[PDB]
Design a protein around this ligand. Sequence first.
Ligand SMILES: *[C@@H]1O[C@H](CO)[C@@H](O[C@@H]2O[C@H](CO)[C@@H](O[C@H]3O[C@H](CO)[C@@H](O[C@@H]4O[C@H](CO)[C@@H](O[C@@H]5O[C@H](CO)[C@@H](O)[C@H](O)[C@@H]5O)[C@H](O)[C@@H]4O)[C@H](O)[C@@H]3O)[C@H](O)[C@H]2NC(C)=O)[C@H](O)[C@H]1NC(C)=O
Ligand SMILES: *[C@@H]1O[C@H](CO)[C@@H](O[C@H]2O[C@H](CO)[C@@H](O[C@H]3O[C@H](CO[C@@H]4O[C@H](CO)[C@@H](O)[C@H](O)[C@@H]4O)[C@@H](O)[C@H](O)[C@@H]3O)[C@H](O)[C@H]2NC(C)=O)[C@H](O)[C@H]1NC(C)=O
Ligand SMILES: *[C@@H]1O[C@H](CO)[C@@H](O[C@@H]2O[C@H](CO)[C@@H](O)[C@H](O)[C@H]2NC(C)=O)[C@H](O)[C@H]1NC(C)=O
Ligand SMILES: Nc1ncnc2c1ncn2[C@@H]1O[C@H](CO)[C@@H](O)[C@H]1O
Ligand SMILES: [Fe+3]
Ligand SMILES: [Zn+2]
Ligand SMILES: [Zn+2]
Length: 341
Amino acid sequence: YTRVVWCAVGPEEQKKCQQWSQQSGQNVTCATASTTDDCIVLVLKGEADALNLDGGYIYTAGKCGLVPVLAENRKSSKHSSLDCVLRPTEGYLAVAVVKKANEGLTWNSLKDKKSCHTAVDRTAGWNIPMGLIVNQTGSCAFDEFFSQSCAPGADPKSRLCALCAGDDQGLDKCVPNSKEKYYGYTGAFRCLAEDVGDVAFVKNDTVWENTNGESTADWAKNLKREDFRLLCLDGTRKPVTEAQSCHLAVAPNHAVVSRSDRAAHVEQVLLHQQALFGKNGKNCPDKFCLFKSETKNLLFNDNTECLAKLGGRPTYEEYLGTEYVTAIANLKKCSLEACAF
Ligand SMILES: *[C@@H]1O[C@H](CO)[C@@H](O[C@@H]2O[C@H](CO)[C@@H](O[C@H]3O[C@H](CO)[C@@H](O[C@@H]4O[C@H](CO)[C@@H](O[C@@H]5O[C@H](CO)[C@@H](O)[C@H](O)[C@@H]5O)[C@H](O)[C@@H]4O)[C@H](O)[C@@H]3O)[C@H](O)[C@H]2NC(C)=O)[C@H](O)[C@H]1NC(C)=O
Ligand SMILES: *[C@@H]1O[C@H](CO)[C@@H](O[C@H]2O[C@H](CO)[C@@H](O[C@H]3O[C@H](CO[C@@H]4O[C@H](CO)[C@@H](O)[C@H](O)[C@@H]4O)[C@@H](O)[C@H](O)[C@@H]3O)[C@H](O)[C@H]2NC(C)=O)[C@H](O)[C@H]1NC(C)=O
Ligand SMILES: *[C@@H]1O[C@H](CO)[C@@H](O[C@@H]2O[C@H](CO)[C@@H](O)[C@H](O)[C@H]2NC(C)=O)[C@H](O)[C@H]1NC(C)=O
Ligand SMILES: Nc1ncnc2c1ncn2[C@@H]1O[C@H](CO)[C@@H](O)[C@H]1O
Ligand SMILES: [Fe+3]
Ligand SMILES: [Zn+2]
Ligand SMILES: [Zn+2]
């Protein structure tokens, strides 16, 4: 009857997907690709049905005619009465984080310092910070601003990949999937924590989830929040508790995309799947939890409370908002109607 094919990016997501596939009685199955771009192509071809994406990729996917189905929703103070599935999403804060110990480093002295990015083309790790850097720089030269970086998905042999480490044994350097040690929110923050870079571009949640005992990963277990600072755009430095006054931008939540002709079908099965393995699901802690992967953010961010319905039936532009959509257009003149494929 109603069977959905999920697209996993890399071997670790593949493994989580296989687990979810087993436990769902094959109501969901898995396709695997090496990168997000490749997963998008599988969906266009019709060989995969769906995957969850950061806003940067929702933009790529959108030009290709894919559509947002459901969005990640995390815990909230305000909007509290409403059920998670119906509650509007709040977005996330993209911030630039540094070590307190690295004094006199401000937004205005980042020139030729070392940077850690989640990946190329992602919202907090790339589009926002580079969008800003290009704009206040006049130059589309973003690859020469930092002396060295880890920016997964850039040319392996460039300075933008210099700080990337690859895997266990040094392979897959700078691949934009979790084989790369410094990939994604967790990896970029690890890049800073281990003093590989001077600055990481992540979101506010990442700092709080890998400090003060929240993570039990060994590179993060001794980390303290007071040891970091946020860099604000006004040239000041603030404690991490101040993200609401010291952020680069507010980002649209990650969301599930699918081909438009499959949207309804994909929506139905996942609402059912989340009842079963979601945050309150018939079986989260006993058999399987869709929203956990021990801080690795596999398939979905681990802080996800549920996947929310989008009311207003957004096109991908409305979903990303005009604000962010122009930020991307502008950045992309550097490196108007298209679809990468
Ligand atoms: C940056 O990111 C970090 C990490 O995401 C954010 O911090 C996280 O924020 C969440 C919620 O925003 C926080 O949740 C904890 O909060 C309390 C602590 O015990 C727990 O339960 C509480 O429950 C009650 C009711 O459910 C409620 O209090 C009530 O408030 C009303 C009205 O104000 C009042 O009448 C009474 O006082 C009520 O009791 C609270 O809302 C609260 O939820 C939660 O279950 C949970 O433990 C996370 O702990 C926190 N994450 C971490 C790891 O620290 C941060 O907000 C982001 N900042 C910015 C700037 O956006
Ligand atoms: C890099 O550099 C460019 C240079 O501007 C910048 O591009 C864009 O900057 C503006 C921000 O989006 C954009 O202005 C448009 O937005 C206007 C706002 O709409 C108004 O809001 C009110 C408030 O509630 C509403 O009532 C109502 O919707 C109202 O219209 C809108 O009026 C117009 O569409 C404006 O054009 C500007 O057009 C755009 N400029 C260019 C060159 O495209 C990028 O954002 C910069 N990049 C980064 C990362 O900052
Ligand atoms: C796989 O598909 C369906 C999703 O609803 C589930 O089986 C359904 O169970 C209900 C109630 O017993 C029936 O009304 C449906 O008709 C059943 N589906 C069909 C068409 O056979 C089943 O739970 C799902 N598997 C899991 C574990 O996710
Ligand atoms: N509190 C907020 N302030 C400003 N913009 C927001 C906020 N919440 C969500 N957004 C934006 O709404 C857009 C989706 O309509 C997203 O791009 C997101 O950036
Ligand atoms: Fe993101
Ligand atoms: Zn703001
Ligand atoms: Zn509309």
